[PDB]
Design a protein around this ligand. Structure first.
Ligand SMILES: *C(=O)[C@H](NC(=O)[C@@H](N)c1ccccc1)[C@H]1N[C@@H](C(=O)O)C(C)(C)S1
Length: 260
């Protein structure tokens, strides 16, 4: 009864709205906090786009090797990897890595493009039993996280279940699941979010997200030493539109729900 008491003060002291879903695969217990409220996904949505492509590749053998042109026109606000390939190409594999590991926003757009637009990414979620996920826009506007808006949202519960299906279950074939885990395990943007609330010794594969209204999110699969893995989704959003990011809130939330 404490664990939920502690998350609620974190929420107060942090002055925001906090969503949490933990899945302990050791006994399939869950910890839920507003786990059925909608939250602007922001970049944590890149995991579903990369997954949708991977799924496709299972019936398009070398889909991951198809070349995709990067045009100067394509660049948006955050383009750390694509910017190096303008008037060149990137493979779908390279765009998946870049989207997942550096949060490259051109890469996402390319992923969205090659599955059929945001509605079909959503359609892929439905294929997975996720009836909550909805991708409605492209980069960069899908990060507005305006309150009460439902575009580009999901619920902590639905995305932890989905992320377990994708990284540990059988949503993807063995090869594609392994690729997603290696990509996520290779994220460079997560060191201050879920990760910072765990023992430094644990292995983490995570995808951060951030957007307007101070919205700071992270979604992770976690392999502690000598334990069964966890799936943890932390979503955090704030009232004022200009609020600064609070990755530390995700770290505290992870700390609270992993204590014990
Ligand atoms: C997903 O929201 C998020 N960021 C973006 O989509 C960009 N608009 C952006 C990224 C980085 C800096 C500035 C803007 C992922 N990018 C991660 C990062 O590199 O720090 C993140 C933690 C900002 S999330």
């Amino acid at each position: 009864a404490d664990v939920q008491q502690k998350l609620a003060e974190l929420e107060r002291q942090s002055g925001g709205r906090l969503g949490v879903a933990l899945i302990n695969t050791a006994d399939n217990s869950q910890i839920l906090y507003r786990a059925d409220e909608r939250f602007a996904m922001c970049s944590t949505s890149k995991v579903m786009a990369a997954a949708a492509v991977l799924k496709k590749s299972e019936s398009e053998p070398n889909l991951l090797n198809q070349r995709v042109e990067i045009k100067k026109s394509d660049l948006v606000n955050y383009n750390p990897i694509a910017e190096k390939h303008v008037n060149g190409t990137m493979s779908l594999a390279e765009l998946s890595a870049a989207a997942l590991q550096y949060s490259d926003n051109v890469a996402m757009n390319k992923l969205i493009a090659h599955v059929g637009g945001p509605a079909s990414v959503t359609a892929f979620a439905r294929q997975l039993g996720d009836e909550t996920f909805r991708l409605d826009r492209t980069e960069p506007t899908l990060n507005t996280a305006i309150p009460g808006d439902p575009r580009d949202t999901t619920s902590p519960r639905a995305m932890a279940q989905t992320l377990r299906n994708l990284t540990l279950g059988k949503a993807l074939g063995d090869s594609q699941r392994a690729q997603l885990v290696t990509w996520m395990k290779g994220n460079t943007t997560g060191a201050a979010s879920i990760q910072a609330g765990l023992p430094a010794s644990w292995v983490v594969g995570d995808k951060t997200g951030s957007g307007g209204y101070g919205t700071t999110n992270d979604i992770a699969v976690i392999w502690p030493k000598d334990r069964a893995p966890l799936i943890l989704v932390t979503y955090f959003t704030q009232p004022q539109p200009k609020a600064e990011s609070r990755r530390d809130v995700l770290a505290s939330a992870a700390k609270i729900v992993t204590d014990g």
